[PDB]
UniProtKB/Swiss-Prot annotation:
UniProt source species: Bacillus subtilis (strain 168)
Gene name linked to the record: yoaJ
Protein's cellular compartments: Secreted, Cell wall
InterPro entries according to UniProt: Expansin_CBD_sf (IPR036749), Expansin_CellWall (IPR051477), Expansin_EXLX1-like (IPR049818), RlpA-like_DPBB (IPR009009), RlpA-like_sf (IPR036908)
Protein name: Expansin-YoaJ
Keyword Iron on entry: no
Keywords: Cell wall, Secreted, Signal
Chain's role: May promote colonization of plant roots. May cause loosening and extension of plant cell walls by disrupting non-covalent bonding between cellulose microfibrils and matrix glucans. Has very low expansin activity (in vitro). No enzymatic activity has been found. Binds to peptidoglycan and to plant cell walls.
Amino acid sequence: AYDDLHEGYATYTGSGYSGGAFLLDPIPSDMEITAINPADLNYGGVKAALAGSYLEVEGPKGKTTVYVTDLYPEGARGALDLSPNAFRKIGNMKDGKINIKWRVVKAPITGNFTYRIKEGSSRWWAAIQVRNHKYPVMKMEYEKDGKWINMEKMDYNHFVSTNLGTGSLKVRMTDIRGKVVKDTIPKLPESGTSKAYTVPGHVQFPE
Ligand SMILES: OC[C@H]1O[C@@H](O[C@H]2[C@H](O)[C@@H](O)[C@H](O[C@H]3[C@H](O)[C@@H](O)[C@H](O[C@H]4[C@H](O)[C@@H](O)[C@H](O[C@H]5[C@H](O)[C@@H](O)[C@H](O[C@H]6[C@H](O)[C@@H](O)[C@H](O)O[C@@H]6CO)O[C@@H]5CO)O[C@@H]4CO)O[C@@H]3CO)O[C@@H]2CO)[C@H](O)[C@@H](O)[C@@H]1O
């Protein structure tokens, strides 16, 4: 987002570093992270729209930036569940709950997307996650026989389709601002991949 704004409340949690719902592991233990309420997570009617986004969060004591790694199931609109190293920067740990303002911001990252091909993926069914993206990824499409096919983003932060075809995949990704970039991902196997793997991408959303 270039500009954005939300109000709500934050609490804190030790979860989300490992086994978070968005399958973004490994998460370095000293990263500042957050779980996010389902209503804001599924922005624009896209499941996990905000997975792997970064938020700037302002509390009573200051501002800080967090990586969104997990779902906050019991969260109301605007609600966030921060890691302790983030919460203590913007509020007092003696509080179980604080008022916050927050917004989607550009990821503090460098380089291009990487893609994660989920175990079980094949030409018949594949789940493809985008990582290292500067803004939330709202949409992913691949080209098959001259037409662009929309992939459904899943709760587990991968985009899914079926009968994708043989050969390398031409893909296009759309961010929360409507910016579109295109890339190529190496071919999917004929049989389901026994293990998940990552592939370096060659494109990034614009600044
Ligand atoms: O030779 C005879 C004829 O064959 C035809 O071709 C057939 C072919 O024979 C057949 O093998 C093939 O079967 C494939 C299916 O088409 C395809 O749908 C299927 O996809 C499965 C996949 O195997 C499986 O791994 C995957 O599991 C996902 C799951 O969906 C997902 O929900 C779950 O996510 C969870 C996370 O793992 C978890 O961490 C998180 O917390 O929760 C998540 C959500 O709950 O993840 C798992 C694992 O990744 O599901 C998909 C989809 O259901 O794969 C089959 C085997 O490859 O079909 C072909 C076409 O029908 C020819 O057409 C004909 O000519 C021949 O004569």
